[PDB]
Amino acid sequence: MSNISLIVGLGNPGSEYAQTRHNAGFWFVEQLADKYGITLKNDPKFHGISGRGNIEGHDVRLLLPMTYMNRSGQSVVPFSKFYQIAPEAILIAHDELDMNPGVIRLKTGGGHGGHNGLRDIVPHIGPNFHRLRIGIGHPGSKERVSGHVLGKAPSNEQSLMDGAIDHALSKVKLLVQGQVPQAMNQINAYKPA
Ligand SMILES: Nc1ccn([C@@H]2O[C@H](CO)[C@@H](O)[C@H]2O)c(=O)n1
């Protein structure tokens, strides 16, 4: 059903990418894992870091692909296939250029929206998974995007994103319980200030 049983955080591996905007998904899932005491550990068979544990009475798996962003499907696809997790039971947290820092919205379905992590996943499991879109803002230049997503946000924008992520963590209860509509209402209403 639409109970969430896999939460994927997208990002790039390595200390040099850890604090970049493109790792917003990693930030969310890492903080989720700590909140619920879920151990994230190297999972070489699935080219990622993974964990499993109890979130609010529900058995949930967590996955961070260690493939680099544009190859995220090399982790997500075989992982979800092996555990027989339908896309409708997957939440993928990812950075979103089309929303401001501090804005966070749940979306079901649709395309990759230019996101090359999602672009590597949608072809294989289809579009029908859920996304936690973590706003990272857009750069000045339309050609500045690589420099933006692989760049570190200013303390100001970082605080907004951290606050939004903190809010989302408080609503994961609704997601694993399969009240996706309520989770959408309460997440998507978040104002940073
Ligand atoms: N070694 C690297 C470095 C960066 N990336 C980034 O992931 C983005 C997917 O939107 C790509 O657009 C890119 O910015 C990646 O996949 N692999």
Side-chain angles (χ1 to χ4, degrees):
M1 296 212 168
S2 296
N3 297 83
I4 297 307
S5 75
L6 174 55
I7 302 176
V8 180
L10 301 184
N12 282 307
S15 67
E16 77 274 25
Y17 292 109
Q19 301 178 123
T20 66
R21 297 182 182 88
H22 224 29
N23 274 41
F26 275 26
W27 307 336
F28 173 78
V29 172
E30 286 171 13
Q31 295 167 39
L32 181 60
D34 187 65
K35 180 175 175 76
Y36 287 98
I38 299 164
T39 295
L40 292 168
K41 84 290 174 224
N42 187 36
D43 193 347
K45 179 189 186 178
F46 297 115
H47 306 277
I49 283 171
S50 75
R52 176 197 184 183
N54 188 310
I55 297 180
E56 305 288 348
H58 298 274
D59 181 35
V60 184
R61 293 177 185 281
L62 304 184
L63 177 68
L64 306 175
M66 290 296 129
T67 53
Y68 292 96
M69 182 67 89
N70 66 5
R71 297 171 172 197
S72 295
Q74 194 180 357
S75 181
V76 174
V77 176
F79 192 94
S80 73
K81 280 217 280 177
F82 180 82
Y83 292 110
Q84 294 205 313
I85 299 163
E88 293 81 3
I90 304 176
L91 174 64
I92 304 194
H94 70 86
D95 55 306
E96 177 55 72
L97 286 169
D98 198 37
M99 297 174 343
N100 294 319
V103 179
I104 191 156
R105 304 222 271 263
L106 193 71
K107 181 185 176 213
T108 302
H112 50 74
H115 195 282
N116 291 320
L118 298 178
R119 175 149 74 154
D120 198 54
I121 296 160
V122 178
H124 304 294
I125 64 167
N128 296 309
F129 56 89
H130 311 279
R131 309 92 184 278
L132 188 65
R133 304 169 76 193
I134 304 165
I136 60 156
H138 196 265
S141 294
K142 190 83 166 286
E143 265 280 299
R144 279 321 274 139
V145 171
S146 191
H148 186 72
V149 307
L150 305 175
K152 181 170 160 69
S155 313
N156 163 54
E157 295 178 3
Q158 192 62 56
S159 303
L160 292 165
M161 294 186 285
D162 296 346
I165 288 164
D166 191 82
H167 175 81
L169 293 171
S170 76
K171 307 307 191 180
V172 175
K173 176 187 174 59
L174 293 162
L175 286 153
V176 303
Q177 284 170 187
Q179 297 189 279
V180 178
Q182 273 147 300
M184 202 168 280
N185 282 342
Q186 289 176 45
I187 290 165
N188 300 19
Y190 179 77
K191 310 159 180 279

